[PDB]
Amino acid sequence: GXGGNDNXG
Amino acid sequence: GXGGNDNXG
Amino acid sequence: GXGGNDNXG
Amino acid sequence: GXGGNDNXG
Amino acid sequence: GXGGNDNXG
Amino acid sequence: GXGGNDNXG
Amino acid sequence: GXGGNDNXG
Amino acid sequence: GXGGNDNXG
Amino acid sequence: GXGGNDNXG
Amino acid sequence: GXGGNDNXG
Amino acid sequence: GXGGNDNXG
Amino acid sequence: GXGGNDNXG
Amino acid sequence: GXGGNDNXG
Amino acid sequence: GXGGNDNXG
Amino acid sequence: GXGGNDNXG
Amino acid sequence: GXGGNDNXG
Amino acid sequence: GXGGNDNXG
Amino acid sequence: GXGGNDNXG
Amino acid sequence: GXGGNDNXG
Amino acid sequence: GXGGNDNXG
Amino acid sequence: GXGGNDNXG
Amino acid sequence: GXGGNDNXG
Amino acid sequence: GXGGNDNXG
Amino acid sequence: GXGGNDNXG
Amino acid sequence: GXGGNDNXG
Amino acid sequence: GXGGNDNXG
Amino acid sequence: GXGGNDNXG
Amino acid sequence: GXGGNDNXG
Amino acid sequence: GXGGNDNXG
Amino acid sequence: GXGGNDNXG
Amino acid sequence: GXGGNDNXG
Amino acid sequence: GXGGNDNXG
Amino acid sequence: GXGGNDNXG
Amino acid sequence: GXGGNDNXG
Amino acid sequence: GXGGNDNXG
Amino acid sequence: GXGGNDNXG
Amino acid sequence: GXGGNDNXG
Amino acid sequence: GXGGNDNXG
Amino acid sequence: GXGGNDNXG
Amino acid sequence: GXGGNDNXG
Amino acid sequence: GXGGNDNXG
Amino acid sequence: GXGGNDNXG
Amino acid sequence: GXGGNDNXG
Amino acid sequence: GXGGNDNXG
Amino acid sequence: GXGGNDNXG
Amino acid sequence: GXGGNDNXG
Amino acid sequence: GXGGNDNXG
Amino acid sequence: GXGGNDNXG
Amino acid sequence: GXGGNDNXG
Amino acid sequence: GXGGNDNXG
Amino acid sequence: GXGGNDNXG
Amino acid sequence: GXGGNDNXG
Amino acid sequence: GXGGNDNXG
Amino acid sequence: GXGGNDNXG
């Protein structure tokens, strides 16, 4: 979707 | 969806 | 359609 | 269609 | 973490 | 982490 | 990480 | 179609 | 008018 | 008018 | 009008 | 989807 | 029982 | 039972 | 997805 | 995906 | 049971 | 994908 | 216009 | 216009 | 215009 | 014989 | 004989 | 004989 | 469920 | 008949 | 007939 | 489910 | 009949 | 000495 | 499921 | 001495 | 001494 | 006249 | 007249 | 007249 | 069989 | 068989 | 067989 | 074992 | 074993 | 083993 | 089982 | 099983 | 099994 | 230790 | 230890 | 230890 | 002593 | 002592 | 002592 | 996934 | 995946 | 995948 430091599994 | 440090599984 | 974090653990 | 993070763990 | 995974955004 | 994976965005 | 993988964007 | 991160773990 | 048009018919 | 139009018909 | 037109018919 | 340091599987 | 129509499952 | 139509599964 | 969807016709 | 979808016809 | 139409699976 | 889709015709 | 399915399983 | 399927499985 | 499938499996 | 003897383990 | 003897393990 | 003897392991 | 022993079915 | 909007999710 | 809106989720 | 022993089926 | 919009997800 | 079987079908 | 022993089927 | 079988079908 | 079988079909 | 058929005399 | 056929005399 | 055929006298 | 004829449709 | 003829349709 | 003829259609 | 008419219609 | 008419219709 | 008419229609 | 003019199915 | 004019299926 | 004019299928 | 019997079914 | 009986069913 | 019997079914 | 000894063990 | 000894063990 | 010894072991 | 590990046995 | 490892046994 | 390793045994 915008601009974060994200990481999902 | 915007701009957080998020991580879900 | 413009939804946010679409993520299934 | 313009959705955000499309990701299946 | 197992389970069927589908959705349109 | 297993499971069928499909979606249109 | 296993599972069928398909989607149109 | 213009979606974001299209990625199946 | 515009967005995802992921529709088999 | 615009947004997700994930609709099989 | 424009976007993804992933539609088999 | 824009501009983060992201990594999902 | 036969099946349905307009549906990934 | 036969099957459906307009659907990846 | 789960299973054993359309079956004892 | 799961399975055993259309079967005991 | 036969199969469907307009569908990767 | 899963499997055993169209079978006991 | 109708038939149907039948099986001693 | 209709037939159908039949099987002792 | 209809036939069908049949099998003792 | 009938059927569907040992199966939903 | 009938069928579908040892199967949904 | 019938069939579908040892199978969904 | 597994099966039995000492039995044609 | 034309918007001059910014970037959909 | 045209908005000049900002970015949908 | 596995199977039995000492049995034509 | 033409927008001069920016970049869809 | 015991295990068993397990399946989301 | 595997199979049995000492049996034509 | 025991294992077993397992399957999302 | 025991293993077993496993399959998402 | 259909139906599983077995018996020892 | 159909059906599995077995018996020891 | 169809059906598996076996027996020891 | 005594004049009749059992048969699905 | 005694004059009749069992047969699906 | 006694005059008849078992046969699917 | 010494039974009389052993016959399944 | 010494039974009489062993015959499946 | 010494049985009589061993015959499957 | 003895001596009649018999005929069963 | 003895001595009649018999005929079963 | 002895001595009749017999005929079964 | 020996009968001199006649003919079992 | 021996009968001299006649013919079992 | 020897009968002198007649003919088993 | 004698008769049918149809017994899997 | 004698008769059918249809027994898998 | 004698008869059918149809037994896999 | 957050430290754990879902797994049948 | 977050440290764990889903796996049947 | 995040350190783990899904794998049957």
Side-chain angles (χ1 to χ4, degrees), chain p residues 1-2, chain y residues 4 6:
Chain y
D6 289 345

Side-chain angles (χ1 to χ4, degrees), chain e:
Chain e
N5 64 34
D6 289 345
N7 55 15

Side-chain angles (χ1 to χ4, degrees), chain D residues 1-2, chain F residues 8-9, chain G residues 8-9, chain H residues 1-3, chain I residues 1-8, chain J residues 5-7, chain K:
Chain I
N5 291 283
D6 289 345
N7 47 319
Chain J
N5 291 283
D6 289 345
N7 47 319
Chain K
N5 291 283
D6 289 345
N7 47 319

